Structure formats: structure tokens, C-alpha cells
Design an enzyme around this catalytic site. Structure first.
Site, PDB file in Angstrom:
ATOM      1  N   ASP A   1       0.801  -1.212   0.000  1.00 33.92           N
ATOM      2  CA  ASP A   1       0.000   0.000   0.000  1.00 33.92           C
ATOM      3  C   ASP A   1       0.843   1.276   0.000  1.00 33.92           C
ATOM      4  OD1 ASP A   1      -1.878   1.933   0.274  1.00 33.92           O
ATOM      5  OD2 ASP A   1      -2.854   1.063   2.060  1.00 33.92           O
ATOM      6  N   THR A   2       0.985   1.904  -1.167  1.00 33.74           N
ATOM      7  CA  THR A   2       1.776   3.133  -1.293  1.00 33.74           C
ATOM      8  C   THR A   2       1.122   4.334  -0.615  1.00 33.74           C
ATOM      9  OG1 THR A   2       0.885   3.741  -3.493  1.00 33.74           O
ATOM     10  CG2 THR A   2       2.831   2.303  -3.434  1.00 33.74           C
ATOM     11  N   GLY A   3      -0.173   4.215  -0.306  1.00 31.56           N
ATOM     12  CA  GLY A   3      -0.864   5.273   0.416  1.00 31.56           C
ATOM     13  C   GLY A   3      -0.662   5.196   1.922  1.00 31.56           C
TER      14      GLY A   3
HETATM   15  C1  LIG Z   1      -6.328   7.074   2.764  1.00 36.49           C
HETATM   16  C2  LIG Z   1      -4.812   6.868   2.813  1.00 36.49           C
HETATM   17  C3  LIG Z   1      -4.118   8.220   2.813  1.00 36.49           C
HETATM   18  C4  LIG Z   1      -4.371   6.112   4.074  1.00 36.49           C
HETATM   19  N1  LIG Z   1      -4.917   4.744   4.135  1.00 36.49           N
HETATM   20  C5  LIG Z   1      -4.214   3.824   3.205  1.00 36.49           C
HETATM   21  C6  LIG Z   1      -5.206   3.500   2.069  1.00 36.49           C
HETATM   22  O1  LIG Z   1      -4.498   2.901   0.987  1.00 36.49           O
HETATM   23  C7  LIG Z   1      -6.448   2.663   2.511  1.00 36.49           C
HETATM   24  C8  LIG Z   1      -6.209   1.171   2.803  1.00 36.49           C
HETATM   25  C9  LIG Z   1      -7.542   0.521   3.220  1.00 36.49           C
HETATM   26  C10 LIG Z   1      -8.087  -0.507   2.444  1.00 36.49           C
HETATM   27  C11 LIG Z   1      -9.308  -1.108   2.792  1.00 36.49           C
HETATM   28  C12 LIG Z   1     -10.008  -0.674   3.917  1.00 36.49           C
HETATM   29  C13 LIG Z   1      -9.474   0.352   4.702  1.00 36.49           C
HETATM   30  C14 LIG Z   1      -8.245   0.952   4.361  1.00 36.49           C
HETATM   31  N2  LIG Z   1      -7.400   2.706   1.394  1.00 36.49           N
HETATM   32  C15 LIG Z   1      -8.509   3.448   1.419  1.00 36.49           C
HETATM   33  O2  LIG Z   1      -8.889   4.179   2.337  1.00 36.49           O
HETATM   34  O3  LIG Z   1      -9.296   3.359   0.220  1.00 36.49           O
HETATM   35  C16 LIG Z   1     -10.653   3.812   0.206  1.00 36.49           C
HETATM   36  C17 LIG Z   1     -10.800   4.419  -1.176  1.00 36.49           C
HETATM   37  O4  LIG Z   1     -10.864   3.277  -2.014  1.00 36.49           O
HETATM   38  C18 LIG Z   1     -11.609   2.254  -1.334  1.00 36.49           C
HETATM   39  O5  LIG Z   1     -10.976   0.989  -1.487  1.00 36.49           O
HETATM   40  C19 LIG Z   1     -10.464   0.481  -0.245  1.00 36.49           C
HETATM   41  C20 LIG Z   1     -11.085   1.345   0.852  1.00 36.49           C
HETATM   42  C21 LIG Z   1     -11.581   2.607   0.143  1.00 36.49           C
HETATM   43  S1  LIG Z   1      -5.105   4.180   5.674  1.00 36.49           S
HETATM   44  O6  LIG Z   1      -5.584   2.838   5.637  1.00 36.49           O
HETATM   45  O7  LIG Z   1      -6.006   5.086   6.320  1.00 36.49           O
HETATM   46  C22 LIG Z   1      -3.678   4.150   6.456  1.00 36.49           C
HETATM   47  C23 LIG Z   1      -3.177   5.299   7.088  1.00 36.49           C
HETATM   48  C24 LIG Z   1      -1.941   5.283   7.729  1.00 36.49           C
HETATM   49  C25 LIG Z   1      -1.215   4.090   7.775  1.00 36.49           C
HETATM   50  N3  LIG Z   1      -0.004   4.057   8.399  1.00 36.49           N
HETATM   51  C26 LIG Z   1      -1.711   2.939   7.171  1.00 36.49           C
HETATM   52  C27 LIG Z   1      -2.942   2.967   6.513  1.00 36.49           C
END
Ligand SMILES: CC(C)CN(C[C@@H](O)[C@H](Cc1ccccc1)NC(=O)O[C@H]1CO[C@H]2OCC[C@H]21)S(=O)(=O)c1ccc(N)cc1
Lengths: 99, 99
Positions: free
Chosen positions: A25-27
């Protein structure tokens, strides 16, 4: 390897000796895992995402292995709906994003 | 482009004509932008991130351009701590993770 993004980039990692399904996860700034028990002292941290915050325990110097690669770094443990390897670990193994 | 992960993979994108810095987020299925005004009709939707559900507006058929690449897709407009490009767009422009 060279992994495209038509599906979620999920791999099997061994973290602290345990097999866990993880999203590359690059995010994610840092690696966060839900289903794992790591021993010893930890520090209280928090992470922020879409929908709000998650309280996490920060475990330091953990062995992380996946796809023939090995790294040591911190792991945040808590009630995240997704297990992610973040940039703290991916940067260490020379992972790049390319197009 | 070859984008390292020792820092956040942030690029300048044009999204429906609007220039915005965005995070290339391999852990997002979807593209979610807080800091944008898009014209035309939209669909009310709720998406779950790390902290649970948020209300977004889904805009379809949005042209997204960055780093000499172009793709058309849906944009979710709503609250997020970072404006992210998800796989819906990245898979269309041949983005890969490499290590
Ligand atoms: C929003 C990002 C800046 C940060 N997120 C990583 C992110 O890649 C998450 C990773 C993620 C994946 C699944 C469920 C929750 C979080 N994806 C996400 O929120 O995506 C949303 C938009 O597309 C949809 O598809 C998946 C969820 C929806 S995060 O999960 O909140 C996160 C924040 C900080 C850390 N250290 C680790 C993870």
C-alpha cells in the site's frame, strides 16, 4: 517482481514469524496489521484515514518477509480493516511505483 | 515515471480540468478527492475507509491526467485526509509496483 493493479496487490507476508495476508500500500506511510501478536514493549500511536482514526500499538525492529525480500522495521498493530505493508517497509526493499 | 517510496508518491494531476496534487495510493480501490469542485450530476454513495463509512459524491466519466498519462474514470468527492488516486485509474495507465 512487477505487480500490476487490476486487482488488489495482496501478498503473503511473514511478520514476526506469522503468516499474514497483506496489501502492498503506497498510500500507507507505515505498516499496519490487525491479526498478529508480537511480544514485548510497544508505544501507543494513532493513524488517520478515510472515516477517522485507529489507535495502534507500535512494535519496533520486527522481521518482515514477502516475495523473497526481507526487511526489519516497525509494525503498528490495531483494529484496521486492512492489513497493509506501507512505505516504511517498501522503501527499505527498493520498491518503486512505475508507469 | 519511476516513483520512489522514501517519500509520499505525490504527483500533479489534472482531474476534470482541475490541477491538484494527489497521492498515488495502491491500497485504494477508488479515487477519492476532498479538494475539488466538479460540474454536472453525481450519485450519492458511502465508502468505508480505515475509520468506517463516509458520504461521497460519485462523479463518472472524469478525465484524469498525470505525468504524460491519461485515463477516464469515476471520482468520489468527500472527506479524506489525502486526495488519492486509486486503482480504478492506476490500472488503466499501466501502473506497476516493482522490487
Ligand atoms: C487514505 C490513505 C491516505 C491512508 N490509508 C491507506 C489506504 O491505501 C487505505 C487502505 C484501506 C483498504 C481497505 C479498507 C481500509 C483501508 N485505502 C482506502 O482508504 O481506500 C478507500 C478508497 O478506495 C476504497 O478501497 C479500499 C477502501 C476505500 S489508511 O488505511 O487510512 C492508512 C493510514 C496510515 C497508515 N499508516 C496505514 C494505513
Amino acid at each position: 517482481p512487477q505487480i500490476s493493479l487490476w486487482q488488489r496487490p495482496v501478498v503473503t507476508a511473514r511478520i514476526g514469524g506469522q503468516l499474514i495476508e497483506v496489501l502492498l500500500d503506497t498510500g500507507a506511510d507505515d505498516t499496519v496489521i490487525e491479526d498478529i501478536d508480537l511480544p514485548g514493549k510497544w508505544s501507543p500511536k494513532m493513524i488517520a484515514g478515510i472515516g477517522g482514526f485507529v489507535k495502534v500499538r507500535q512494535y519496533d525492529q520486527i522481521l518482515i518477509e514477502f516475495c523473497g525480500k526481507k526487511a526489519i522495521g516497525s509494525v503498528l498493530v490495531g483494529p484496521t480493516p486492512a492489513n497493509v505493508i506501507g512505505r516504511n517497509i517498501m522503501s527499505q526493499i527498493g520498491c518503486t511505483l512505475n508507469f
